Design an enzyme around this catalytic site. Sequence first.
Site, PDB file in Angstrom:
ATOM      1  N   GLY J  30      34.953  29.018  39.197  1.00 14.61           N
ATOM      2  CA  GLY J  30      35.083  30.433  39.061  1.00 14.61           C
ATOM      3  C   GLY J  30      34.850  31.200  40.367  1.00 14.61           C
ATOM      4  N   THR J  31      34.403  32.410  40.176  1.00  2.70           N
ATOM      5  CA  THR J  31      34.035  33.445  41.137  1.00  2.70           C
ATOM      6  C   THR J  31      32.525  33.224  41.513  1.00  2.70           C
ATOM      7  OG1 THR J  31      33.403  35.070  39.443  1.00  2.70           O
ATOM      8  CG2 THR J  31      35.710  35.011  40.104  1.00  2.70           C
TER       9      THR J  31
END
Lengths: 144, 233, 102, 250, 82, 243, 77, 242, 243, 245
Positions: J30-31
């Site tokens: 993800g981020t």
Amino acid sequence: FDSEKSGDREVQRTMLELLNQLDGFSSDDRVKVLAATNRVDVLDPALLRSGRLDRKIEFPLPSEDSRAQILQIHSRKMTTDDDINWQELARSTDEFNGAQLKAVTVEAGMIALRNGQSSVKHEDFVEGISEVQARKSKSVSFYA
Amino acid sequence: FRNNYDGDTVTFSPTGRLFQVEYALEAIKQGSVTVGLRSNTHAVLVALKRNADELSSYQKKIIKCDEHMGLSLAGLAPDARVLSNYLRQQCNYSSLVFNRKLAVERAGHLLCDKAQKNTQSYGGRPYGVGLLIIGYDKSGAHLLEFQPSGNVTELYGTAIGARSQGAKTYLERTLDTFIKIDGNPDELIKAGVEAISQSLRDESLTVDNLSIAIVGKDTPFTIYDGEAVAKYI
Amino acid sequence: QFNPYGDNGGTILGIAGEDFAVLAGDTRNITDYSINSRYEPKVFDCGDNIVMSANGFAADGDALVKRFKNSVKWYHFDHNDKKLSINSAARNIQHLLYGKRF
Amino acid sequence: MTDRYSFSLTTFSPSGKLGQIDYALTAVKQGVTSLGIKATNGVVIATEKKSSSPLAMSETLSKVSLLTPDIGAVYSGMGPDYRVLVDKSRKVAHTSYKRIYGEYPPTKLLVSEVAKIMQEATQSGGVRPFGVSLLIAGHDEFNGFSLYQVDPSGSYFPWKATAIGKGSVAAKTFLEKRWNDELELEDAIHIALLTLKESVEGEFNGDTIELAIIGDENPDLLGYTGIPTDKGPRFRKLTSQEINDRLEAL
Amino acid sequence: VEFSLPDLEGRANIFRIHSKSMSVERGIRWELISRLCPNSTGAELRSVCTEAGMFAIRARRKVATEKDFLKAVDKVISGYKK
Amino acid sequence: DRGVSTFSPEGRLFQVEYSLEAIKLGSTAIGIATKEGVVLGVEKRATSPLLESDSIEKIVEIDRHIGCAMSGLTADARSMIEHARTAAVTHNLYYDEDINVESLTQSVCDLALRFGEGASGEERLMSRPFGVALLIAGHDADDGYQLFHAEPSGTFYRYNAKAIGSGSEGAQAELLNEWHSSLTLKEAELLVLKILKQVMEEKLDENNAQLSCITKQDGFKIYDNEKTAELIKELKEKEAAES
Amino acid sequence: LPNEAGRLEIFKIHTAKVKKTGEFDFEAAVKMSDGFNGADIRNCATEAGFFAIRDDRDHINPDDLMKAVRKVAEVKK
Amino acid sequence: GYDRALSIFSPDGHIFQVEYALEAVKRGTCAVGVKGKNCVVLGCERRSTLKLQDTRITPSKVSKIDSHVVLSFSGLNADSRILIEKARVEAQSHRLTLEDPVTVEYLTRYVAGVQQRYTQSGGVRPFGVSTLIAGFDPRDDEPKLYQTEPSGIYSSWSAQTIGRNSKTVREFLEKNYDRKEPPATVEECVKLTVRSLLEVVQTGAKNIEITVVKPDSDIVALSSEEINQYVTQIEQEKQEQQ
Amino acid sequence: AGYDRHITIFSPEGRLYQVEYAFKATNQTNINSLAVRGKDCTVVISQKKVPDKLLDPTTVSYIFCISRTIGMVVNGPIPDARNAALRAKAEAAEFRYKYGYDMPCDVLAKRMANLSQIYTQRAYMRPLGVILTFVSVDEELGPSIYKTDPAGYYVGYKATATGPKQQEITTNLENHFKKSKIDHINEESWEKVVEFAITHMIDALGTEFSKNDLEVGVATKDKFFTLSAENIEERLVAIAEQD
Amino acid sequence: GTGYDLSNSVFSPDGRNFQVEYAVKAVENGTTSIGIKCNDGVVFAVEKLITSKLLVPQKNVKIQVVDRHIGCVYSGLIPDGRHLVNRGREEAASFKKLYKTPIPIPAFADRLGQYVQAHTLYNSVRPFGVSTIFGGVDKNGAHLYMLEPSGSYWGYKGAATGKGRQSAKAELEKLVDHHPEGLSAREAVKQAAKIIYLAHEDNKEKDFELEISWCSLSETNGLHKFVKGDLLQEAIDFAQKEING
């Protein structure tokens, strides 16, 4: 890593030597070794060391800027009617790789071959994409 | 192998998510092109209706959920119905319990949860259908994108279906202009038809394929259906 | 102990005519000698040329009506916005009424 | 979401066998030498005590459990399977008989109740079947002293002496020869130490034998020192010193 | 390139094509022969013309008939099943 | 066994695809909706002296305004009919009027989704999907005469004419040419017989074909053996005089 | 697996033959690994060096060294 | 939960489990029904090879479903009890509720319906049985003969034959019956039924069990003595057509 | 069925693969524990390390206080340890209401063992990996140590160790107890009891450990307490006060 | 080896099921999101990716509230993170009714922990593939916690997870040392913003939009509130001053 690594001796030995020899001479950069495959296979540890094949480089897929450059390289080689917009065609192709943008150019020419044209218009390329390139082709619009 | 992780919906794979889930995202593109656009006071939905034959009659690609709400589907039909009933149920209860219409945001987050539950259940499946859900609540005009794995995004504009990337290029340019026209329905509507015909490149447009729905500050859920879309091209 | 059931008064009058029909009602709402409301619409449009008034006890009116309002909505969804007939609506109420008698 | 497992995990193989019962039995053969003897003047059961550690209590450890007051059981197999099974056997024995007919279940009737637990577990999926075999040695005042075998599947058969575990057959030979009925309980204890010395070599003691008898009474096993009303237990487990005393008694 | 499943119009053409070379006695419509296939492959089609000819040779015949073609469809498809 | 939630790289379920395979093996059902009626015709097929051929038919009545003809597995079409009768009966009691043919198809299609292991969305109680597709024909006072094709997949489309069955590829092609927007009930039934004759490898009798019609002074009405045969009698002579 | 002590010695030894601006805190570097033996530690050294060829120098900061050990850790175990 | 799959599609648009159900019936014994225009005859095999069976408590092949209705079968007895029980209950259910004697068509729909359910529904498999259902509708003198398969499909048939060498018995029967002139007299329709079923039982005249159903609950099972007599006769007929 | 390690069912050999793998690699998580008995205390020493400066080591817990008097030392990972803790805590509390009495080590051990066994037979659950050592100073037995291990097997100890320095700890205590003719040392104050523990610990694992690298849990009559960081250094310095 | 890549209902010899390994991997995919404990509070910040101008600000914030004083932010895949939180919420409403007090941050760690752990005893339920960083102020002090997808969780002084996990721990570890724990809550917004900046350097294929929120007992009064306006705007400037580029 099984007991069939016995049979596969010849392959352990060619590799080991090539590595032993590179680290032997690691400070001097004279020779490079590159191995290539579709995908990473089981191997003896060697990704952990500068003097062996340290670096592990991934190929991703292209993106809109990349497809468009690849299309401009393609369009020097072969005639076009000089109106064709790579960016626009690039939006129209989803999850295409470089080799597959090259096969569209061939199919665009197969339309052209039937049509009695010696160049390709925008349409000629759009129709080329619809036909198979054999790994991915954007043409989806069926469902009732 | 493919066949190793495919059989039931309960397994993760090294990719980070299951193969089957990607195949559900892929189906949306097969089904009908629908574009979504908004200004800040109204939000517009434009959808291409397809049938199978001459002597076939159209399948509706707009299903009205309320007199201030509706959605478009793209992808697998049978799931789009099972979802539109759930949204109906959710809506009504809100009105019965809380006197509340049901926000687009509020609905999205309930719908997401339902989607996780059907992707942890092994006999269960991803829905295989994406939806563009539009509304005007007291949060303003809205467009949301729903994906059948529980991915919910709020957007100015977007497309699902045939060459989504196609429409998206159009919208991203004309964006700054149309969205500041706030209080004129017709313009935003006219931009919707102008967009959708350029996504097309192996289909053509016509009057009774197209169907437009607008909701807004002074437009209660209204469909222009058949003939009456001519005056927005 | 407990029985909420009483009365709240009010009066309604329905007349079928030649092409038309009325539902006239007063707008006074009571509980005994106290004034609950001096305006409160006691004829209400449920839609479809059907206007409706449940005179008697208020507490049942509100309930009867809410069950029925969601039926007007569900009839439309499930049958593509096909408008509800006075006779059909009357049958739908019969079933509601009959649904509680315990 | 949640389980859906209802498909039987015990199934027939091409020969007419049941895979799970075959497997479970291998474990039992490899388990601790246990025997049972009916002395006719009692019943003596002996089993191997073991220690995990010298710094470990073996008071907690369970190799001989009282299933019902006059009845003990011992086993070869899988220890964890044994422990749970003893529990379901104790429970049903108490609820369904001890104020219904006003006393403990008869030995044969209790062997059938165990048999049923194991068979439920073999028929039904979600769970694998018990992996155990028991020797249930007992007294009931309407059948005398008894010895049964309970198999992993829940097949049972009557015995008057047997041994199961490792090194069974030869253990039965020594027992067959030395005892042929009408024998003091004490004497059967002596014979039992002798059979097991020949069976286990490397180190042997009465501190590695755990011995129980059903074949005595004390006032303390009526559980009161007043005026009788009933007979009460006849289960008595011996302490290590008493066993060393019988090892000294030729 | 496909060599998978053809159309009804298509099955007809491949039938028509193998039976030109053969003598035949009248009453054949290819369309009818095609009809009995719920799904075929090209291999199956080649089997219908050649099998239809065999029923005729057993009876000692040079010609092929509408009956024979039907008889060959029934045999071939049913064996393919499972 | 085989996944119940496992899709193709396109995203079309195995079970759906397999549903499409049983359909293609039944005998043709052909509908033409016209402006005076809906005609539904079937090939019943089989003629034997050890067979009662006029005691079995593939055109079954749901309601006094709704029929269905089927193609595919017939055993499966019995569960579909049991669900459909119950749903229509309960709606006639609540609002006193006709249920919509589109509405019926959606209610049925909802229970076509169960197969396999259960969901947490749905309790899947069956084992396979239904292996029959249907042409449901009816009348309603708010869209008149109509004809509908329900696929067991979930999709149901309204049509003016559609053929299903084994021999549908040819049949449909004929339907279009013969179809026009001033077509009537009486012409449509004669034409049905033309189509049926053409594609048969036999003589058309009423112990291999059955007709049915819808008129709104009588509801769904079976065109009986006696009338269907009289129509067959008239066909054979007129055709056999164009040669 | 090494000690914390083993990693320190080997980082110090590798950066001793190396040319650097600034005294290096090897102790941080050790934390930034978890059990790197001498070969793994060498990849971290060269990694720092890569931003130094780019920064047009034969010296390296403390600053380079913290980033470098972490990027090598992430790309494998 | 054991509502999950146990019956799956074929790629050919059959069902694997229904194809395998029909095989058990074929290996099996043979049952036949031949129609007059006054009766419906049902023949059922009892080919006792061994002589150590006691045959008054050896199961029969004839069940009452109702007093004017019979069911005969070929297939596993074990499965057939389960179907036979559900079908008796259904005759009594109608009788109770409609105040009316049972009609043959509805019962057939019922027999079809339980088998049909178990293919469609999960964690159950179809029965190992094909049946013949026959009888007479109330106040009716014309014969009724139905066939149901464990697929759940159903049909009427003027005559039908099932189990082992179904081909052989259809093929024969086809030459000895016309719908335009079916037999009027019990004796000759029974003669034909015994003759077909002789040809597949091998030796049998006590191993063949005939039960002849005339309108509304006149149901009579002919005996060994009677059958031996028709077999004699058949041995006289076969040297009058030589 | 399935297979013998894709679901929990017997092995070919009558073994259970899952319980033996539960014994092995759940003590190699950088954990080593010992428990020894006092005179009027019970001492546990257990390793407990934090690899960041950014991980608050207070929340880091692997000696838990089950009740006000009961402690449970877990060898094995925090996902498992909290499934066993929740069960332990619940059992403790339930016992207290229902039977009116505080929960003995032994009863808790026995109950948890039988439960794990059931989860071992299940084909849709695992046995937990954890090894659970339950400690207090009971008023019904004195100082007590009872340990369960993962197979549904459990047994009482007078002194125990886990992790592969089991042999070292055991031998030092065994020789010592054979000489003194007691398996409990005699000393009142908790302080001297922790010093006795450390002596055998340091020799046996061959190292000393920091305050934040140790965690020491002490059982007393009607209390269980963990020693603060300074308190654990005080003891390590106090033996070195002697030196 | 095998069976442990499809199931969780049996135990790996490695002590770590192959399916569990795959769950962690999707978190790093993800981020970046981070969490900062300070001397009175917690401040949360996340990098929100900008891809196109068809997305709308502050409606796709990945900060979601639970109760009144717990702010919950995550790395990994969106649907997993929202379902996990919706369950937190429901337990939180139940909590509040029954015990007449707000749900603790330690309690909530347990609630989440037990839902994840439950799905890691069963092959018939599939677990979560997000790491969620959360915290707040309660009756018993300030707390930062991080929940990882095994059903491992602890309280931390500082946390990061995601793509930018490493760069974030570096920049955080320097700032926390310098301060006693992270100084004031005001200061912590500026500090946060520097951490996000360094963490962006692992993205560089998307632009970002900075989003911070806080829970502070001396400058919010125990409530979770967003940091926007003046305070966010000084924070962008501080980052761009010291961090150049």
